[PDB]
């Protein structure tokens, strides 16, 4: 029940706000998280218009495959938070030692507004290979977007606004150009008394 293709598994993912009260005191609020503690399928035709669609778009990448590399995560985000650092962290494992590139596309009404690319290298770990993005800064667009949601009069408006906010993450083997993982993220405001939640789906044609 994981975000895992033939060659790569995303073990952890989180986006957070860390507040430094003093040099020895930090408070961290997780907005969304996977990995802190069969998958249903979603028809890709049902979400195509919420992601970039043209050459290199979600549909185009999905058609190139492999199809077992494509996932849709629905996050119920915990927006209940009160010297600030907005960051993202993620961890991946593979049986192979590869040079990988993670591309993150922030989208508004299915159009790309930001593209962030990071090259990641492997560390040997217990017979396998580990890849990690540790505390990468959230882009200014994202920070502004979080601020905007909080200053909306109602949470009914938050869900309608969040319906047109999506993220597409593409992880590629830099040397073979193979799609190792592709995760499409959709959002809603959480109403859980147990914090942020998620549903992970396999994307199918």
């Amino acid at each position: 029940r994981s975000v895992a293709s033939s060659k790569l598994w995303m073990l952890e993912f989180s986006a957070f706000l860390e507040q430094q009260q003093d040099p020895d005191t930090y408070n961290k609020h997780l907005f969304v998280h996977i990995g802190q503690s069969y998958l249903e399928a979603v028809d890709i035709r049902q979400i195509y218009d919420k992601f970039p669609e043209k050459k290199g778009g979600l549909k185009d990448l999905f058609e190139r495959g492999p199809s077992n590399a494509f996932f849709l995560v629905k996050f119920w985000a915990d927006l209940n938070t009160n010297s600030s650092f907005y960051g993202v962290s993620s961890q991946y494992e593979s049986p192979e030692n590869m040079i990988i590139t993670c591309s993150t596309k922030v989208c508004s009404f299915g159009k790309q507004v930001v593209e962030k690319v990071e090259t990641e290298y492997a560390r040997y770990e217990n017979g396998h290979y580990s890849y990690r993005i540790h505390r990468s800064p959230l882009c200014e667009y994202m920070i502004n977007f979080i601020h905007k949601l909080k200053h909306l009069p109602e949470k009914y408006m938050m869900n309608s606004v969040l319906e047109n906010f999506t993220i597409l993450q593409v992880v590629t083997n830099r040397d073979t150009q193979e799609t190792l993982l592709c995760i499409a993220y959709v959002f809603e405001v959480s109403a859980s008394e147990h914090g942020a939640q998620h549903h992970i789906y396999r994307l199918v044609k």
């Binding site: 979603v42 119920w76 319906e163 809603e188 109403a191 939640q197």
Partner: peptide, 16 residues
């Protein structure tokens, strides 16, 4: 099209 009227699993609207 609003997400609510799309061909999606029942779980899509059921926060864990």
């Amino acid at each position: 099209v609003p997400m609510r009227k799309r061909q999606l699993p029942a779980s899509f609207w059921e926060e864990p």
